[PDB]
Design a protein around this ligand. Structure first.
Ligand SMILES: COC(=O)[C@H](Cc1cccc(C(=N)N)c1)NC(=O)CNS(=O)(=O)c1ccc(C)cc1
Ligand SMILES: [Ca+2]
Length: 223
């Protein structure tokens, strides 16, 4: 997260860390046994860490659970990152509480100008590198599709949306991928891609979750 603020211990209870010997992507807990992340975060031997704040220090509210099955979206295109969404099922159900809680799926798609919460343990520098140990947060509004294309020249699909500031300075970054974008109390996006970080006229691009609710529900009810 570039230009954000320290969230505060366990203030984002649905935020998860994907670990394969080290943190490599974020994700969101949608129920006691399922996690949603980005398909480009796919990897074998994934361990899900819940209740995390400082990812390098056992603080007491963590739950480390191995994944038993990973399901990348059937139409994921790694070249364009269209349909950049993936489902991860935990070996055993997590114990839900104040510090470990699920986030609800949307019933409608968020609209332009809506303020959302983006979070992750990603890089905090637009130039160079600096990775934080604690969870960072950022408030950012959804942008209109035309305004996004006009300024960035990005080729967006109907399964993506832009959020951030055309002025630059604030944005998600390397390592935040797979993480949550929450608006109106529901999971509306997944950190997917961008061009550099916090660059002017180059806002972040996120997977539009409201288009995948049906797929998610059907997959979870049968796996
Ligand atoms: C990979 O290194 C980076 O600094 C960022 C990471 C990132 C990830 C998710 C969201 C954001 C964000 N801005 N909100 C940033 N991505 C890039 O800079 C990738 N763009 S790119 O122009 O470098 C590029 C384009 C196409 C290919 C095949 C490879 C690389
Ligand atoms: Ca910890």
């Amino acid at each position: 997260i570039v230009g954000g603020y320290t969230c505060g211990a366990n203030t984002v209870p649905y935020q998860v860390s994907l670990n394969s010997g080290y943190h490599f992507c974020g994700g969101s807990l949608i129920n006691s046994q399922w996690v949603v992340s980005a398909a480009h975060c796919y990897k074998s031997g994934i361990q899900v860490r819940l209740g995390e704040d400082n990812i390098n220090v056992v603080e007491g509210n963590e739950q480390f659970i191995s994944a038993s099955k990973s399901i990348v979206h059937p139409s994921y295109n790694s070249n364009t990152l269209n349909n950049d969404i993936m489902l991860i099922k935990l070996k055993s159900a997590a114990s839900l509480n104040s510090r470990v809680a699920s986030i609800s799926l949307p019933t409608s798609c968020a609209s332009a100008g809506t303020q959302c919460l983006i979070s992750g343990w990603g890089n905090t520098k637009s130039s160079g590198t600096s990775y934080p140990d604690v969870l960072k947060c950022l408030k950012a509004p959804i942008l209109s599709d035309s305004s996004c294309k006009s300024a960035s020249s990005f080729i967006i699909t109907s399964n993506m949306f832009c959020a951030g500031y055309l002025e630059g300075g604030k944005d998600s970054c390397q390592g935040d991928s797979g993480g949550p974008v929450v608006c109106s109390g529901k999971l509306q996006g997944i950190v997917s891609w961008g061009e550099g970080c916090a660059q002017k006229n180059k806002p972040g691009v996120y997977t539009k979750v409201c288009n995948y609710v049906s797929w998610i529900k059907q997959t979870i009810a049968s796996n």
